[PDB]
From a paper:
Galectin-3 (Gal-3) is an exceptional member of the galectin family because of its unique structure and functional diversity. Unlike other galectins, Gal-3 is a chimeric protein composed of distinct domains. In human Gal-3, the C-terminal carbohydrate recognition domain (CRD) is connected to an N-terminal tail (NT). While the CRD contains the glycan-binding site, the non-lectin NT domain contributes to the oligomerization of this lectin.
Compound 23 is bound to the active site of the CRD in a very similar manner as lactose and LacNAc. Residues His158, Asn160, Arg162, Asn174, Trp181 and Glu184 are involved in direct contacts, and residues Arg144, Asp148 and Glu165 make contact through waters. There is very good electron density for the sulfate and the two sugar moieties, while the nitro-phenyl substituent at O1′ does not show nearly any electron density. This is reflected on the B factor distribution of the molecule 23 that shows the galactopyranose moiety firmly anchored to the active site with an average B factor of 17.42 Å2. The sulfate group shows a higher average B factor of 32.77 Å2, reflecting no direct contact with the protein. Finally, the nitro-phenyl substituent does not have any contact with protein residues and shows a very high B factor average of 178.97 Å2. The sulfate group contacts the protein through water molecules; one oxygen interacts with one water (S1) that is in contact with Trp181, and a second oxygen contacts two waters (S2 and S3) that are in contact with Asp148. One structure makes a water (S10)-mediated contact with this latter residue. In our structure we can observe a direct contact between the oxygen of the N-acetyl group and Glu184 (dashed line in Figure 3c). Interestingly, the nature of the aglycon had little influence on the overall affinities within the Lac and LacNAc series, an observation also corroborated by the X-ray data which showed the aglycon protruding outside the active CRD-binding pocket of hGal-3.
Numbering used by the authors: 113 to 250
Amino acid sequence: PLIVPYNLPLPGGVVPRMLITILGTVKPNANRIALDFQRGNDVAFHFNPRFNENNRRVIVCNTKLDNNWGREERQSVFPFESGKPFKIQVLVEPDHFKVAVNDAHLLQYNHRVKKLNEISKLGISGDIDLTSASYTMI
Ligand SMILES: CC(=O)N[C@H]1[C@H](Oc2ccc([N+](=O)[O-])cc2)O[C@H](CO)[C@@H](O[C@@H]2O[C@H](CO)[C@H](O)[C@H](OS(=O)(=O)O)[C@H]2O)[C@@H]1O
């Protein structure tokens, strides 16, 4: 098991055909989960399941440049459940990150940060027990 918040270095940045797999279990009464793909202080891709935003569950995705959040992309399909194990797979494609949860496609996020090889860390945080976090080339 891994300590949260957890930093996964991505040596040499991300590249198309890179697949990141995260296994964990959502804590009971969870509030939030966050994946943060970072380019230095910037957040290239923030993937943020929210379990109670005005009594709705929503996934918020965004980019942070020079400390400023951009336009949010919101997904109301919500595959996470308090107390239950999950698998997140993030596949880097030429034009987007492609996210599947529990083997089902969830969303795509078009690349706003264009220097993919400078996106050199993934931060994993929030109300989870983290079982594994790894990458492979497919
Ligand atoms: C419905 C909605 O849009 N809510 C956003 C709200 O928007 C409005 C705020 C005020 C007014 N007003 O006053 O009328 C109108 C809109 O602004 C918040 C601050 O930007 C957003 O929260 C941030 O969202 C980020 C991702 O985008 C990160 O997740 C971040 O968390 S962090 O720890 O990583 O750094 C988190 O704070 C909210 O999602």
